[PDB]
Scaffold this active site. Structure first.
Site, PDB file in Angstrom:
ATOM      1  N   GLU C  51      31.366  34.628  48.826  1.00  0.00           N
ATOM      2  CA  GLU C  51      32.326  33.631  49.306  1.00  0.00           C
ATOM      3  C   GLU C  51      32.710  33.782  50.768  1.00  0.00           C
ATOM      4  N   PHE C 113      44.031  37.228  31.954  1.00  0.00           N
ATOM      5  CA  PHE C 113      42.851  37.701  32.644  1.00  0.00           C
ATOM      6  C   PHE C 113      42.703  36.999  34.014  1.00  0.00           C
ATOM      7  N   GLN C 114      42.586  37.819  35.055  1.00  0.00           N
ATOM      8  CA  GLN C 114      42.404  37.449  36.456  1.00  0.00           C
ATOM      9  C   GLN C 114      43.426  36.397  36.900  1.00  0.00           C
ATOM     10  N   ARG C 256      33.954  43.354  79.334  1.00  0.00           N
ATOM     11  CA  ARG C 256      32.841  44.104  78.797  1.00  0.00           C
ATOM     12  C   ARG C 256      31.697  43.190  78.363  1.00  0.00           C
ATOM     13  N   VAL C 386      28.381  39.913  65.920  1.00  0.00           N
ATOM     14  CA  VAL C 386      29.379  40.653  66.679  1.00  0.00           C
ATOM     15  C   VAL C 386      28.844  42.062  66.971  1.00  0.00           C
ATOM     16  N   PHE C 471      27.662  49.042  69.648  1.00  0.00           N
ATOM     17  CA  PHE C 471      28.855  48.715  70.409  1.00  0.00           C
ATOM     18  C   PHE C 471      29.925  49.802  70.225  1.00  0.00           C
ATOM     19  N   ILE C 472      30.038  50.330  68.992  1.00  0.00           N
ATOM     20  CA  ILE C 472      31.040  51.353  68.666  1.00  0.00           C
ATOM     21  C   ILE C 472      30.587  52.729  69.113  1.00  0.00           C
ATOM     22  N   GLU C 475      31.625  53.054  72.586  1.00  0.00           N
ATOM     23  CA  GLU C 475      33.044  53.306  72.644  1.00  0.00           C
ATOM     24  C   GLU C 475      33.373  54.773  72.394  1.00  0.00           C
TER      25      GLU C 475
HETATM   26  C1  LIG Z   1      34.305  39.852  33.006  1.00  0.00           C
HETATM   27  C2  LIG Z   1      35.336  40.560  32.126  1.00  0.00           C
HETATM   28  C3  LIG Z   1      35.727  40.027  30.901  1.00  0.00           C
HETATM   29  C4  LIG Z   1      36.624  40.689  30.086  1.00  0.00           C
HETATM   30  N1  LIG Z   1      37.033  40.118  28.892  1.00  0.00           N
HETATM   31  C5  LIG Z   1      37.553  41.002  27.951  1.00  0.00           C
HETATM   32  C6  LIG Z   1      37.571  40.639  26.577  1.00  0.00           C
HETATM   33  O1  LIG Z   1      37.069  39.550  26.151  1.00  0.00           O
HETATM   34  N2  LIG Z   1      38.140  41.552  25.721  1.00  0.00           N
HETATM   35  C7  LIG Z   1      38.702  42.721  26.148  1.00  0.00           C
HETATM   36  O2  LIG Z   1      39.114  43.533  25.281  1.00  0.00           O
HETATM   37  N3  LIG Z   1      38.748  43.039  27.465  1.00  0.00           N
HETATM   38  C8  LIG Z   1      38.160  42.189  28.341  1.00  0.00           C
HETATM   39  N4  LIG Z   1      38.135  42.547  29.657  1.00  0.00           N
HETATM   40  C9  LIG Z   1      39.049  43.585  30.145  1.00  0.00           C
HETATM   41  C10 LIG Z   1      40.469  42.983  30.177  1.00  0.00           C
HETATM   42  O3  LIG Z   1      40.619  42.119  31.321  1.00  0.00           O
HETATM   43  C11 LIG Z   1      41.613  44.040  30.231  1.00  0.00           C
HETATM   44  O4  LIG Z   1      41.384  44.890  31.381  1.00  0.00           O
HETATM   45  C12 LIG Z   1      41.567  44.974  28.982  1.00  0.00           C
HETATM   46  O5  LIG Z   1      41.478  44.220  27.769  1.00  0.00           O
HETATM   47  C13 LIG Z   1      42.860  45.761  28.949  1.00  0.00           C
HETATM   48  O6  LIG Z   1      42.504  47.087  28.487  1.00  0.00           O
HETATM   49  P1  LIG Z   1      43.602  48.203  28.214  1.00  0.00           P
HETATM   50  O7  LIG Z   1      44.786  47.659  27.548  1.00  0.00           O
HETATM   51  O8  LIG Z   1      42.800  49.313  27.603  1.00  0.00           O
HETATM   52  O9  LIG Z   1      43.997  48.737  29.694  1.00  0.00           O
HETATM   53  P2  LIG Z   1      45.286  48.534  30.612  1.00  0.00           P
HETATM   54  O10 LIG Z   1      45.522  47.090  30.862  1.00  0.00           O
HETATM   55  O11 LIG Z   1      45.063  49.466  31.767  1.00  0.00           O
HETATM   56  O12 LIG Z   1      46.534  49.027  29.753  1.00  0.00           O
HETATM   57  C14 LIG Z   1      46.685  50.422  29.413  1.00  0.00           C
HETATM   58  C15 LIG Z   1      47.998  50.431  28.589  1.00  0.00           C
HETATM   59  O13 LIG Z   1      48.165  51.831  28.132  1.00  0.00           O
HETATM   60  C16 LIG Z   1      49.504  52.231  28.425  1.00  0.00           C
HETATM   61  N5  LIG Z   1      49.471  53.701  28.638  1.00  0.00           N
HETATM   62  C17 LIG Z   1      48.914  54.363  29.690  1.00  0.00           C
HETATM   63  N6  LIG Z   1      48.919  55.692  29.464  1.00  0.00           N
HETATM   64  C18 LIG Z   1      49.481  55.860  28.218  1.00  0.00           C
HETATM   65  C19 LIG Z   1      49.816  56.970  27.455  1.00  0.00           C
HETATM   66  N7  LIG Z   1      49.546  58.226  27.841  1.00  0.00           N
HETATM   67  N8  LIG Z   1      50.349  56.765  26.242  1.00  0.00           N
HETATM   68  C20 LIG Z   1      50.654  55.512  25.837  1.00  0.00           C
HETATM   69  N9  LIG Z   1      50.442  54.380  26.500  1.00  0.00           N
HETATM   70  C21 LIG Z   1      49.830  54.605  27.698  1.00  0.00           C
HETATM   71  C22 LIG Z   1      49.873  51.433  29.668  1.00  0.00           C
HETATM   72  O14 LIG Z   1      51.279  51.451  29.915  1.00  0.00           O
HETATM   73  C23 LIG Z   1      49.270  50.062  29.360  1.00  0.00           C
HETATM   74  O15 LIG Z   1      50.138  49.226  28.579  1.00  0.00           O
HETATM   75  C24 LIG Z   1      37.200  41.912  30.527  1.00  0.00           C
HETATM   76  C25 LIG Z   1      36.758  42.498  31.721  1.00  0.00           C
HETATM   77  C26 LIG Z   1      35.834  41.818  32.527  1.00  0.00           C
HETATM   78  C27 LIG Z   1      35.346  42.491  33.815  1.00  0.00           C
HETATM   79  C1  LIG Z   2      32.633  41.518  70.319  1.00  0.00           C
HETATM   80  C2  LIG Z   2      33.328  40.560  71.287  1.00  0.00           C
HETATM   81  C3  LIG Z   2      33.728  40.978  72.553  1.00  0.00           C
HETATM   82  C4  LIG Z   2      34.315  40.101  73.444  1.00  0.00           C
HETATM   83  N1  LIG Z   2      34.747  40.550  74.681  1.00  0.00           N
HETATM   84  C5  LIG Z   2      34.899  39.569  75.657  1.00  0.00           C
HETATM   85  C6  LIG Z   2      34.881  39.932  77.031  1.00  0.00           C
HETATM   86  O1  LIG Z   2      34.668  41.124  77.420  1.00  0.00           O
HETATM   87  N2  LIG Z   2      35.079  38.908  77.926  1.00  0.00           N
HETATM   88  C7  LIG Z   2      35.327  37.621  77.540  1.00  0.00           C
HETATM   89  O2  LIG Z   2      35.403  36.738  78.432  1.00  0.00           O
HETATM   90  N3  LIG Z   2      35.412  37.284  76.230  1.00  0.00           N
HETATM   91  C8  LIG Z   2      35.180  38.253  75.312  1.00  0.00           C
HETATM   92  N4  LIG Z   2      35.187  37.897  73.995  1.00  0.00           N
HETATM   93  C9  LIG Z   2      35.814  36.636  73.586  1.00  0.00           C
HETATM   94  C10 LIG Z   2      37.342  36.810  73.706  1.00  0.00           C
HETATM   95  O3  LIG Z   2      37.844  37.580  72.595  1.00  0.00           O
HETATM   96  C11 LIG Z   2      38.139  35.472  73.751  1.00  0.00           C
HETATM   97  O4  LIG Z   2      37.795  34.705  72.572  1.00  0.00           O
HETATM   98  C12 LIG Z   2      37.705  34.608  74.975  1.00  0.00           C
HETATM   99  O5  LIG Z   2      37.713  35.374  76.184  1.00  0.00           O
HETATM  100  C13 LIG Z   2      38.712  33.487  75.126  1.00  0.00           C
HETATM  101  O6  LIG Z   2      37.950  32.324  75.531  1.00  0.00           O
HETATM  102  P1  LIG Z   2      38.654  30.946  75.896  1.00  0.00           P
HETATM  103  O7  LIG Z   2      39.871  31.143  76.686  1.00  0.00           O
HETATM  104  O8  LIG Z   2      37.514  30.118  76.407  1.00  0.00           O
HETATM  105  O9  LIG Z   2      39.028  30.300  74.456  1.00  0.00           O
HETATM  106  P2  LIG Z   2      40.407  30.116  73.674  1.00  0.00           P
HETATM  107  O10 LIG Z   2      41.066  31.431  73.470  1.00  0.00           O
HETATM  108  O11 LIG Z   2      40.046  29.269  72.490  1.00  0.00           O
HETATM  109  O12 LIG Z   2      41.372  29.303  74.647  1.00  0.00           O
HETATM  110  C14 LIG Z   2      41.087  27.927  74.980  1.00  0.00           C
HETATM  111  C15 LIG Z   2      42.254  27.559  75.931  1.00  0.00           C
HETATM  112  O13 LIG Z   2      41.971  26.176  76.382  1.00  0.00           O
HETATM  113  C16 LIG Z   2      43.164  25.409  76.219  1.00  0.00           C
HETATM  114  N5  LIG Z   2      42.737  24.005  75.983  1.00  0.00           N
HETATM  115  C17 LIG Z   2      42.124  23.513  74.871  1.00  0.00           C
HETATM  116  N6  LIG Z   2      41.729  22.240  75.076  1.00  0.00           N
HETATM  117  C18 LIG Z   2      42.094  21.938  76.370  1.00  0.00           C
HETATM  118  C19 LIG Z   2      42.022  20.790  77.147  1.00  0.00           C
HETATM  119  N7  LIG Z   2      41.446  19.656  76.718  1.00  0.00           N
HETATM  120  N8  LIG Z   2      42.467  20.853  78.410  1.00  0.00           N
HETATM  121  C20 LIG Z   2      43.072  21.974  78.861  1.00  0.00           C
HETATM  122  N9  LIG Z   2      43.256  23.110  78.197  1.00  0.00           N
HETATM  123  C21 LIG Z   2      42.729  23.051  76.941  1.00  0.00           C
HETATM  124  C22 LIG Z   2      43.866  26.051  75.032  1.00  0.00           C
HETATM  125  O14 LIG Z   2      45.227  25.632  74.926  1.00  0.00           O
HETATM  126  C23 LIG Z   2      43.649  27.541  75.297  1.00  0.00           C
HETATM  127  O15 LIG Z   2      44.635  28.108  76.174  1.00  0.00           O
HETATM  128  C24 LIG Z   2      34.562  38.759  73.045  1.00  0.00           C
HETATM  129  C25 LIG Z   2      34.094  38.304  71.804  1.00  0.00           C
HETATM  130  C26 LIG Z   2      33.487  39.207  70.920  1.00  0.00           C
HETATM  131  C27 LIG Z   2      32.959  38.681  69.580  1.00  0.00           C
END
Ligand SMILES: Cc1cc2nc3c(=O)[nH]c(=O)nc-3n(C[C@H](O)[C@H](O)[C@H](O)COP(=O)(O)OP(=O)(O)OC[C@H]3O[C@@H](n4cnc5c(N)ncnc54)[C@H](O)[C@@H]3O)c2cc1C
Ligand SMILES: Cc1cc2nc3c(=O)[nH]c(=O)nc-3n(C[C@H](O)[C@H](O)[C@H](O)COP(=O)(O)OP(=O)(O)OC[C@H]3O[C@@H](n4cnc5c(N)ncnc54)[C@H](O)[C@@H]3O)c2cc1C
Ligand SMILES: Cc1cc2nc3c(=O)[nH]c(=O)nc-3n(C[C@H](O)[C@H](O)[C@H](O)COP(=O)(O)OP(=O)(O)OC[C@H]3O[C@@H](n4cnc5c(N)ncnc54)[C@H](O)[C@@H]3O)c2cc1C
Ligand SMILES: Cc1ncc(C[n+]2csc(CCOP(=O)(O)OP(=O)(O)O)c2C)c(N)n1
Ligand SMILES: Cc1ncc(C[n+]2csc(CCOP(=O)(O)OP(=O)(O)O)c2C)c(N)n1
Ligand SMILES: Cc1ncc(C[n+]2csc(CCOP(=O)(O)OP(=O)(O)O)c2C)c(N)n1
Ligand SMILES: [Mg+2]
Ligand SMILES: [Mg+2]
Ligand SMILES: [Mg+2]
Lengths: 586, 585, 585
Positions: C51, C113-114, C256, C386, C471-472, C475
């Site tokens: 994503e 869940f989630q 730079r 970058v 780059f790092i 640095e």
């Molecule tokens: C893709 C996906 C799908 C899933 N779908 C399922 C599903 O269909 N079915 C399923 O079962 N799970 C499923 N899970 C997992 C689910 O989301 C929950 O994490 C799980 O069911 C909860 O497990 P749990 O209660 O063992 O753990 P936890 O949620 O960690 O709860 C532990 C509990 O134990 C208590 N506790 C801790 N220590 C002690 C202790 N010493 N004595 C007493 N109590 C204690 C805590 O206070 C808490 O209430 C899925 C996971 C994934 C990744």
């Molecule tokens: C790894 C890395 C290193 C970098 N190091 C450097 C470096 O050493 N030197 C460097 O130069 N850059 C460097 N950069 C980029 C830097 O971080 C800044 O993004 C850049 O310097 C700012 O450029 P800017 O002012 O053109 O853009 P912006 O920060 O986007 O500013 C645009 C400005 O224009 C104004 N503006 C917008 N539209 C108009 C308009 N129509 N008329 C008038 N004003 C307008 C805005 O209000 C704003 O003040 C680096 C980038 C990376 C990825």
């Protein structure tokens, strides 16, 4: 066989034992309001005058009783007004449920009136933060929020589109999990670790036991350990009262909302037993810089070694651990370190009594607090605002295990005095409740004095009117190069504010006025709230973190000026007492 | 005496026992790199080819060992590439530390090159999420991050301005709190709650014990409770292997990554003991709609009564509680329910064996997994990707308590097969490690096959090439009105991809090719990674959530069609066996 | 009469002219997929293999055409994989719409869940970021997203619960607002500000015009101002090609990814006209420390006086303003400053040609880029990854106004080469398209070489294989105390990777192999993609920011060493040419 989703939500609250909840209605929350209206005989809605007071009161409920506090705010500004109370709950780690109104689902994301994406507003403050999108799952979402708030000791927020609570859902599908609730398991102390801890503590030359509110169930053990082993006690400010203030080896708290003996002793100690304590000044103030061995007991693994490197760390309940220590020790004889500290505490307490015991002249905070002590019931509850009052109440209130006191411990939001007292009176109608607040903090939530009137909550409000943000003035004195700014302001007559909300009140400005006014207030508050507006001087409280008393540390001029400013001519530095008993000052 | 703050940071990692960590360097993290470079004897830096693989591998380290995984990414795009692994760690509740590069403090908030406020990026994923602003406190911040990640079983992220690690700090101030770390000693399981739970379980006519990975320490107790009481076992998919798959009363898992006997029995059960289980399908699938009494054992108050209205929920450790049950019960004779379930399992396993045991013809996933079983060592570790492979591996792998298997359980990120296998081999260099992955998921992280080569990590990679997102194709079959889209795609020859990263490999497309290729791969993987690209058919695996076998439930035509498509002519519905032993369905 | 909400969503996309969109299906987005499936004649779905490539390609579409790019990802990991492309779009300020799958409304907030609260994931990247909760308003939400993405030149994200697109909504209610879209008509550039700017520029002794891509419409005016007034030109790297590289007074870019003449002249200039430019190095490099007067033209109030204290900043369009300057000036005779800069450019270009013109021996990046130039069509499009490739391509490609080139300008995400080339070929199927990428960046997105094959997109891919993050590495050479780490790695043979995705390919490692391989690739790419894997040396390219050529500035030993390492024996410092024409440095 159907029920409105909103009715089911209220039933969930009822299953969890919620007695009362706070907020202000709006169109965006009127479907929850409708459900509350039907349930008024079973759950009790408290309409506040600003939603921050509702959130603060909800946090205070949980501080007091351990029961989740509940508040709400209407969409947009109602909810954002909750923030100072929500952050208080987060930072003071108490469970609160907050419901936020929202536009109905048919109008969300249309940019309609007072309609916005509300979820990002609450993301930082909340443990759990969801916008409900379905009526049939709404009871579960509320249930989930409550259960999480309890388990995680913090804030759960649910944004509720107003249409959902008016939708019918199947009557027989929803449930509450209140029946299944349990509090966390209390882990047990490892025997060998406790034995090693004990050995290290007993081998110390200048030991201290330094506890916080994690030791709130362990006051008996703390005091007996102290007495048996001849080891002084000190605490965090919030942990005042766990051991009675009268105990002669209670040093107080360190830093600024602090007592002199605690600061002085901590600087000399070689071994500290740090128990149920998350003192936030540890690192920044270098509190433990010269501590040789640091022994920690805490229930939270996140705390172990947090504030200093540990030599022995015990992950266990404080009372079980302290009991285990006590059970393996026997009575020890006095030491020089013990006697030096005892003498230092007597000297300090004599100082505070000298301030309290004035009988005439310009009123200071110290005599106001003496007057509070003289009308205070043994099990009184104190809701304390933020500022010099924390400092002064910490020094002067005479607390025992029977009392409670609350403030905004860590977020330190001003304005909590009034809401915390509302909460206290709702939870403990038969106990005396004070709101002790500075003028700046009282000002911030003053409108909710009307709430005490409306609900006939007999709070004794005491406002400390210095016409300053005194706590901050003193900081500017300490740090700023230019003139004071923003810290001196015009008077507000809180006796007139009280009159405006239809509360009986008094204004006093002289020591000799206190006894009768406080007696009258004591009696009024058998049935109705009352306010005393105490016009006090601009005298700075002695800064326990900036002592100028030891010849070896400070110039004669500076000592003289300190004694003169703080009426401290009879205070001795701890080194005087160390030297009497043959110990070096370090 | 002074130390560079970066050197102190690395010593904090060492104090906490971090063996290895993953990332890709950049200017914005080159001062941490510099500190790592001086500490190669004591901590082992693994340079990955995409930062997501480092994050996924860090999560897998913690899944496997219980010890915090560590990864890093350079400012901007290095760190954002971590996300799929960080969300995996959050959702699978495992401790991970992520370090993010940042521009030096002198250029922050100047809108300079690749400089942004990075703190909001990580606010949602992270338990702890801070931008460091001071060198002297940097070791503490890292220590704090680690300690919270452990305490809170999640992700801690620290954004580090690149100047700070090159600053000198006092040598004797910094410390690590690894020395304070320990695990709690718990009280006895609550005696009167466990006793009343036990009576309710034993009074049931059709009981099941349904465990998750919270019961990971309780396999012996689970199996002995099952055998003694005549109560079948079922599990979450991740809990496969806690009790050996060969155990005759292990029904499997429910829902889709599921086995037929578990779905069928759960619908019939009157009492379920839900232990160490947070099954996410409970409510949406109405799994427990029929269940009369629902009993729970869990260690987390946040879970008590969460998934269904619960009659008795015991807050306790699973093993200790199951042992306390076992100490208060004794033998029950075989029941009709027990025998019916035994018979149902036997019939299901015969079906799976019939798929596995084909000897020639076009290759299906079923025989590939048989071939894995026939080269697998008893303590093998399986890193499993996301898709049909979860379903098929859950049915076919023959696991025991000696194995481990990991996937992305709840976030379900594809691409986890490769990084999980890298982590497994780094932690367990003497244990056989498989990566079982579909073509879609292997594709996503294919470049990090080169990491297995570079670090000589002898993973056996098995890619299931159907030229589809098969799991999603089947979903579209079930829900979509219009033609399949995005689910059938052009072949990638992963044997050639392997050759490109200098890994030995094979491609197979016929059942009869499997034995000699898998033997060769088993032997190559005594010393080097290997890949087998298995070209498999597009056959849909039996949908355990869509059974059409019971003539009381389904039409003859639907049953006939189901049996044909899924090679299921000899499967019997559970009702057959219930009837055989005198029970109503 | 009703329409499915998903069908209406696709018609909103069609109304806005969206030609193609990218993503990977999943259950959580299968109802949008279903709508796409019915609309294949009118909108073209491109199934990518990761994503991030879809998000990067969507950004590239908008970079190239100015028309919103569209991508999607499935719930949880599909969407989080978009991030590097979404941050690219935010930082390069181009319009992109991203659709994110979500669990149906009946299961949201059930911890299924989630299923998660997805809104916080996208809050930082997105201009507009909403979770849809109603089917009837869904078309409007998509329309709103598009309209904001355009208006605000950034990313709009909509999370879509999968049930909503399968709901019927009234057919005649929904609409799109594409019909309202237009561009503003602006007043004349501010007459008295432009006149006073012009006088300050002309009064300068050592003027420069320094433009960025905001001057993209003003190439003719830039070149004619330069020629008429005898004022050299320099640009941002992205602004390369707005004026043809062959123009004799084009100095290149600074910092730079830079050319020597631009750095040297900028340090000497007394007046800079900064137009359409947001150069991010201005402050951190103290680029303008020496500059007496700083003049700006920009279209965005947020930019006025941003990068340096500005004497006159004109809020106006670049082309219109430059034309208004040109209408009020006339020929100036050649100056010493002009001649010195001309000579400096000639000397620099001779250096670059000497690198390009080697005919045999171990292959360097320089000759690879000459070989690209010798098969490049006049209107070719370049998608550039970058790393060192930015530096080398900036120096060697011979661009004109007829070309386009794109990279990740400011976020600087590696891996952009492949997706940018995919987008370029989809938009411009009759134009030659290159992907120029280092081995590190190509590796990150290598699987989407299969997308070029699948969609028959005839990209010419050129991978620069140095077995380094070069780059790092450079640095680390400059900053790090300890040995190189993470910057040298094991070979990947990208010709074999290409073969694995069924793409024709070549691998070369000698200069003399280039002509016939590049001719073959040019011919293959009349119909199909092709890849050339160029195995290049580890030689560090000349650091234009670290020049050691001026004996007033640098020791003889340092100069000797610089000249040796960079094959720079014949380069002269600008001061030589200043002196030649009678100017002090
Ligand atoms: C893709 C996906 C799908 C899933 N779908 C399922 C599903 O269909 N079915 C399923 O079962 N799970 C499923 N899970 C997992 C689910 O989301 C929950 O994490 C799980 O069911 C909860 O497990 P749990 O209660 O063992 O753990 P936890 O949620 O960690 O709860 C532990 C509990 O134990 C208590 N506790 C801790 N220590 C002690 C202790 N010493 N004595 C007493 N109590 C204690 C805590 O206070 C808490 O209430 C899925 C996971 C994934 C990744
Ligand atoms: C790894 C890395 C290193 C970098 N190091 C450097 C470096 O050493 N030197 C460097 O130069 N850059 C460097 N950069 C980029 C830097 O971080 C800044 O993004 C850049 O310097 C700012 O450029 P800017 O002012 O053109 O853009 P912006 O920060 O986007 O500013 C645009 C400005 O224009 C104004 N503006 C917008 N539209 C108009 C308009 N129509 N008329 C008038 N004003 C307008 C805005 O209000 C704003 O003040 C680096 C980038 C990376 C990825
Ligand atoms: C204006 C203002 C100024 C302040 N300044 C000061 C000041 O100068 N000095 C001062 O002392 N305070 C001061 N405070 C308060 C301060 O900010 C901290 O809130 C306080 O010091 C911390 O107290 P604590 O450790 O008791 O509580 P918490 O921070 O709540 O910590 C409680 C600890 O106990 C542990 N715990 C809980 N239950 C158990 C159990 N069963 N067994 C064992 N461990 C357990 C917890 O895990 C935790 O570590 C001030 C407050 C205000 C409003
Ligand atoms: C809402 C809020 N704003 C600012 C502060 C900072 N603050 C801490 S104490 C203080 C002054 C409190 O003044 P007041 O209530 O009059 O008490 P005093 O110290 O004068 O007795 C301020 C402004 C805060 N904690 N809360
Ligand atoms: C990064 C990511 N994108 C999308 C999905 C949704 N998804 C779940 S399974 C699946 C198909 C997996 O295909 P493949 O790896 O080929 O396995 P198959 O089912 O074909 O065996 C997809 C796209 C996901 N979980 N992760
Ligand atoms: C995803 C991502 N990770 C890290 C970086 C930091 N980075 C900038 S250039 C570079 C090296 C590029 O290597 P390669 O593609 O091989 O190009 P070369 O410099 O070797 O030609 C790196 C790691 C980045 N910009 N993007
Ligand atoms: Mg005040
Ligand atoms: Mg597949
Ligand atoms: Mg390279």
């Amino acid at each position: 066989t159907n029920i409105l989703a909103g009715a089911a939500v209220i039933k969930v609250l009822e299953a969890w034992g919620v007695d009362h909840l706070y907020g202000i209605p709006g169109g965006s929350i009127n479907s929850i309001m409708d459900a509350l209206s039907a349930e008024r005989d079973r759950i009790h809605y408290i309409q506040v005058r600003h939603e921050e007071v509702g959130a603060m009161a909800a946090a205070a409920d949980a501080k007091l009783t351990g029961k989740i506090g509940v508040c709400f705010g209407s969409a947009g500004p109602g909810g954002t007004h909750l923030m100072n109370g929500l952050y208080d709950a987060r930072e003071d780690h108490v469970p609160v449920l907050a419901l936020i109104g929202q536009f109905g689902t048919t109008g969300m994301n249309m940019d309609t009136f007072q309609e916005m994406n509300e979820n990002p507003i609450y993301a930082d403050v909340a443990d759990y933060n969801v916008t409900a999108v379905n009526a049939a799952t709404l009871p579960h979402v509320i249930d989930e929020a409550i259960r999480r708030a309890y388990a995680h000791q913090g804030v759960a927020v649910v944004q509720i589109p107003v249409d959902l609570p008016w939708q019918q859902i199947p009557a027989e599908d929803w449930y509450a999990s209140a029946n299944s609730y349990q509090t966390p398991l209390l882990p047990e102390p490892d025997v060998q670790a406790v034995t090693r801890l004990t050995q290290t503590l007993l081998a110390a030359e200048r030991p201290l036991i330094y506890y916080g509110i994690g030791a709130r169930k362990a006051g008996k053990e703390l005091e007996q350990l102290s007495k048996t082993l001849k080891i002084p006690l000190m605490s965090t400010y919030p942990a005042k009262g766990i051991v009675a203030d009268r105990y002669p080896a209670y040093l107080g708290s360190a830093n600024r909302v602090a007592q002199k003996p605690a600061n002085e002793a901590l600087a000399q100690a070689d071994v500290v037993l740090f128990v149920g304590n998350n003192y936030p000044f540890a690192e920044v103030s270098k509190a433990f810089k010269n501590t040789r061995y640091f022994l920690q007991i805490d229930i939270d693994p996140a705390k172990l070694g947090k504030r200093h490197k540990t030599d022995i760390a015990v992950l266990a309940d404080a009372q079980k651990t302290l009991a285990a220590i006590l059970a393996q020790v026997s009575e020890r004889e006095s030491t020089p370190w013990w006697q030096a500290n005892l003498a230092n505490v007597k000297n300090w307490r004599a100082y505070l009594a000298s301030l309290e015991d004035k009988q005439e002249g310009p009123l200071q905070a110290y005599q106001v607090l003496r007057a509070v002590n003289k009308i205070a019931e043994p099990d009184a509850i104190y809701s304390i605002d933020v500022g010099d009052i924390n400092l002064n109440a910490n020094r002067h209130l005479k607390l025992t295990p029977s009392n409670r006191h609350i403030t905004s411990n860590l977020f330190a939001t001003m304005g909590v005095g009034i809401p915390g007292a509302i909460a206290a009176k709702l939870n403990y109608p038969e106990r005396q409740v004070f709101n002790l607040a500075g003028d700046g903090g009282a000002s911030m939530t003053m409108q909710d004095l009307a709430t005490q009137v409306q609900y006939h909550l007999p709070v004794i409000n005491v406002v400390f009117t210095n016409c300053q943000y005194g706590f901050i003035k003193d900081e500017q004195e300490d740090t700023n190069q230019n003139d004071f700014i923003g810290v001196e302001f015009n008077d507000i007559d809180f006796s007139k504010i009280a009159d405006g909300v239809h509360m009986q009140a008094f204004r006093v400005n002289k020591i000799e006025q206190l006894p009768d006014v406080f007696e009258q207030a004591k009696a009024i508050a058998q049935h109705e709230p009352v306010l005393i507006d105490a016009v006090i001087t601009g005298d700075r409280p002695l800064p326990a973190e900036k002592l100028r008393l030891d010849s070896a540390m400070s110039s004669a001029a500076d000592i003289e000026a300190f004694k003169q400013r703080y009426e401290a001519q009879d205070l001795q530095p701890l080194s005087t007492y160390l030297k009497q008993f043959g110990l070096d000052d370090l």
